[PDB]
Symmetry: D3
Subunit: 225 residues, 6 copies
Amino acid sequence: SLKHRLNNGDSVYGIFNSIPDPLMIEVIAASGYDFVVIDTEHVAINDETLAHLIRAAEAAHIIPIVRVTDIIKVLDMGARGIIVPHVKDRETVEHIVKLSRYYPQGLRSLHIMVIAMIQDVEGVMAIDDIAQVEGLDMIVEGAADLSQSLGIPWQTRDDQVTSHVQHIFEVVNAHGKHFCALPREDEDIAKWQAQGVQTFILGDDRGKIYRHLSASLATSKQKGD
Amino acid sequence: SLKHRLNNGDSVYGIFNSIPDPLMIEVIAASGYDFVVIDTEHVAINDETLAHLIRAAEAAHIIPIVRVTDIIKVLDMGARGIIVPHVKDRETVEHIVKLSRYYPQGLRSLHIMVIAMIQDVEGVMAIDDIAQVEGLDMIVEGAADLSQSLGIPWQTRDDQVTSHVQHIFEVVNAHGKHFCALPREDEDIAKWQAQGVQTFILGDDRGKIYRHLSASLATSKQKGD
Amino acid sequence: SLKHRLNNGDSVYGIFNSIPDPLMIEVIAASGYDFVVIDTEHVAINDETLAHLIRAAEAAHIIPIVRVTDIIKVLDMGARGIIVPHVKDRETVEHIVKLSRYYPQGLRSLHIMVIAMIQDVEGVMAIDDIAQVEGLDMIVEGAADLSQSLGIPWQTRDDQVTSHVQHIFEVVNAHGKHFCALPREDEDIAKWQAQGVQTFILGDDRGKIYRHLSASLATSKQKGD
Amino acid sequence: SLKHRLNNGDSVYGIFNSIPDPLMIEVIAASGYDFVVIDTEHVAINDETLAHLIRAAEAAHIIPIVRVTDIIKVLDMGARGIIVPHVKDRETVEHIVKLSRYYPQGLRSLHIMVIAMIQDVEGVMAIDDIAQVEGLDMIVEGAADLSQSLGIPWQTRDDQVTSHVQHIFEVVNAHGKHFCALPREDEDIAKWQAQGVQTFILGDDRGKIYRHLSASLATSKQKGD
Amino acid sequence: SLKHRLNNGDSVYGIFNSIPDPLMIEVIAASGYDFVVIDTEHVAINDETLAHLIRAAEAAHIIPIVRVTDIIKVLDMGARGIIVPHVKDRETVEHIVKLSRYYPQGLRSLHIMVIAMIQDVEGVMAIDDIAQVEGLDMIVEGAADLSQSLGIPWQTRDDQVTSHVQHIFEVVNAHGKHFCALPREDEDIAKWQAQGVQTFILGDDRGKIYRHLSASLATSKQKGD
Amino acid sequence: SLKHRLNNGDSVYGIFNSIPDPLMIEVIAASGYDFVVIDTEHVAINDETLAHLIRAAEAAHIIPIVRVTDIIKVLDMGARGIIVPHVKDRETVEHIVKLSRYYPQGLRSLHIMVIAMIQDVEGVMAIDDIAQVEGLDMIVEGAADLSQSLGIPWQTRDDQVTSHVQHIFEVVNAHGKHFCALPREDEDIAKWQAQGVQTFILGDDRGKIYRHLSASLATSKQKGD
Ligand SMILES: O=C([O-])CC(=O)C(=O)O
Ligand SMILES: O=C([O-])CC(=O)C(=O)O
Ligand SMILES: O=C([O-])CC(=O)C(=O)O
Ligand SMILES: O=C([O-])CC(=O)C(=O)O
Ligand SMILES: O=C([O-])CC(=O)C(=O)O
Ligand SMILES: O=C([O-])CC(=O)C(=O)O
């Protein structure tokens, strides 16, 4: 379980999955990733295919986490965690929490990680509010999308964007909630770890595959003469 | 067209596709690859999915080549080329050639590249025979699979295996047929190009993705402390 | 038609379908069931697969009923009935009714059973209200889910839960509406039939299949020595 | 691009697609249609199938337009336009417009035609309101569905229905917005073109295919004796 | 049943299906066709999709006939008939016959029409041979494909091709076997019917749909000015 | 592993799977079955669906065995065993064995159970021959299909059919090969176990589900009055 790793002092490393293919899931698992975030928000993916991917993740012994926007269905498929994007108010979080629990004291019939991602400045302002919900386990930083929402390209990582992120960690960590970082560089990892952060999402598969392939091919032509 | 590139003095670069997902096809096209070899031999892939991939390749402006073992169906799907594995005798090639042509003087109803891959030592012995069929455009070297067929791991690339490969090029090039190389290193490319070789397949997507991801993740943990 | 059976004094027997496979549908039809309730609420099922199941039910001559939560789409697929879960207020029912009718006096373009299931105590309180909508044909008792919503395990069927159910029948039957029971035992059937009840749902396929198989296998090992 | 045609003085002809098959898309493209309106409102169609159709349209060089009711997902699939049905208020249009734009000044991440269809009399009354949104490119007349919403069969095309349609064009054309007509006869085309209309949707594939086939078969039996 | 129609003196009309979509099947059935020939030879179609189409044909009350090249699987799917293409020798027919029968005296486990199509001149020469197999019910003329196999375009329907066809009927009809014609014109129907022919396949859906659509659209532009 | 169970003195119980749905697989696993025989011979099942089922079996911790008639593909999908039907000669077995092994000394690239099923009297006669192949692990009795092949209904289990079966065990057990029985009654299990038999297939899911459901429903109506 993902909690189970975090309670042992373990660092866990994950990646976004933009390609709804079971072989890609098995490839990620073989690469050493502790979990994979199956992104259903920006992927045209059938419900049965999502179930296929969750089964594939389990058979490959990699933790299936699904980024949603039907919460019941995904959790009924066997997802061990739910990342909810663009969380602004606390109303959203408490509703998600009881969407993931049993009747009578929930809206689901018969240790899943309830995760909220902060990607709008509104979510940053209500962070003290948001990060105290009973049921919320993890809060994921989304500095890039947050930057883009402020009319500021993430390419120039301004101080204000970074300030909003560090303010998120401090608040989240103050209530004993888990923090998850999205480091752009591999040395931002060591910086977060020293602060106590254990959970890290390292980009998305489609993004890293394009970068490696196009560059490797470029060198292949370059070396060819 | 692939011939059309080869007739202009152009070098063309391709890759094996082990993941039957249209997004992977579009990723390969965006990486700069001139063609993609959709491998249907070692991929559990539905016939409608294969058609989906060929459409995806066309919309991404990358040349669809299918490695088979139903030749009609694939060619009816819009594949611009057929790579046939484990070709040993000439009987096979001539049959494939007329499987790709019109009635009356073919077995197909209403510039596709007819490609044969040499992966067994039997194919190496009948190479002078094989590489003269009217209709055969390209012969693909498969040194690794050939090595494995000789009870010799490809990890140790022996002289005999390399000798069988260079004998293939010389014979194939003598009859004005196209040669396609599978370089293990990027400097084997320059060596083939100096001999006149224009077509190159650079590994398989699944293989390169595993190698990049697992290593990048390893460095990510390494840098983390 | 399902109404057509009910207007003839016929008893009709159905079952919940938790396995979105056309063969399972055909198996249910061959077992003698008058209808099958394709459960789309707790089944990861593609929209095209649901259409496949409805076609399969029709070709097997078994009445297709779909339990929803897109009402138009299901009815456009050929479903002869709609079971709506967790109905609490009357506002819901009247909206469903006109979701199943023609323009101008509906929200659907060009004898379908409109069915509401009571599973929350709120639905029990508004039962006199709910069971008088023009357009509502059937009301399905859901004692188990109702029990679970009251913090009471259905395993102990308390008097209060049973009281809420019998109060539902009396009210529903008073307005000439059809009642559908979910008997836990096969002798609860005779009791409902004596009251005039004609419609019965006998569990779910997945539930009965697990119970039969696991027990039969257990006896198989037991007999083996 | 569709705008690009309209800015050149070109007339463009499209058709509704009720059959979610890539071959049907390719058939439409080969018939000479400039665009095809993939109708997802009254078609049981998987999300991955919709992506398949958009790829098929692109490879067949026909413009993919999707009629919706997930706007992000369709636009992420590569749709060049969105037709939104039953637009009544302006609130709807402005929301759709910013659903199709970038953050910060939209709700979509990283020349698409924003199209609204008028099918209710409410949409006709708010037409001066609706047809001035910054971001709205085209307004599609839907006289038949509008007729059916007024308790009047479209079979008798009354003056009032036709009046509501001509009032739509005049208002829409006054704000420099594109008008799209649904002519029942082929001579209603010349009438709209003289008014400046360039965009025309000629029925739906399923409708025209049934009409041609059933009639042709009827003549086939008739001629047979 | 198809035999059942033929034994009553009924004429039956069918069409080739090149589009593996259940809606297309239902469209054909609604057009009045007695049967539909699901062409699996030149259609990329999954096995589960073929089963979907057979179910769709049954629910639409149109006879499912499948043109193959796995005979067991199709017959296990519920196909009421099998059309086998390019039959040359009698060995083929007798094998197909016992592929469609029960063990012990067949190769299939637990009134299907066994149909052979003549499309090569070899099949024409062995017609007296072929058309006497115990188990063979129908022989389908394929003049066009036969013409194309003789290096002669079907566009010019020569006397020799027509002679081979009329020789087929005479032989087939002499052994009390059913004849099926593929008339290019609707008056070739009356000619065959006078000879006793009852079964007629009128082109393919994809072919007729392209012809109607492209022409209708052409007139639409023509009328527009 | 299945061998691993058999080498420990463990009895293993399996069932035939006629319904290609992952939920059915998970239901079988939960019922306590040690393995499931995914029957691809009499099931319309896509190749990707078969891969889905194998993943589902692994995630449910039940051993995936596939009954075939593409051996490479299934084994590449992760099947832990292959049951080959209607084995008559030894030529078949030796070919299957080296279809499941590595190059050079096989036809497969980079503890799987190689299983042969005897269902024809020809297989019974060559049993001393068949059951000595190096590579063949298990031989499955198929008395019913064998009976049906002898023009004898399995409903009357004659002495000759039973004699052919007991002759199979004796021969198979003499060469230290694994025997797998298909008991019609649960007390035929104890009889085989006393002879040393450890592997048992208890019918098929579809068969047992029909029998339980139709009977249970019958009692439900019977009890109802
Ligand atoms: O909704 C139903 O019909 C019952 C159920 O499983 C729930 O959602 O609590
Ligand atoms: O086989 C047929 O029925 C006709 C055809 O298109 C071919 O294969 O030449
Ligand atoms: O919405 C549309 O475009 C037309 C239609 O069939 C409806 O929903 O009444
Ligand atoms: O929602 C997210 O996680 C990020 C994103 O691509 C967006 O929707 O702006
Ligand atoms: O092949 C089998 O395993 C049994 C069977 O149904 C057949 O093909 O006669
Ligand atoms: O066939 C190929 O192209 C190579 C391969 O993996 C094999 O089958 O040994």
